[PDB]
Amino acid sequence: GWWLALALAPALALALWWAX
Secondary structure, eight states, X not given: OTTHHHHTSOHHXXXXXXXX
16 A cells, blocks of 8 residues: 555665664
């Protein structure tokens, strides 16, 4: 459903830079 908006940029891209 709507959760497709999460597939566009999961917390991965976030944790990637944050934890980068």
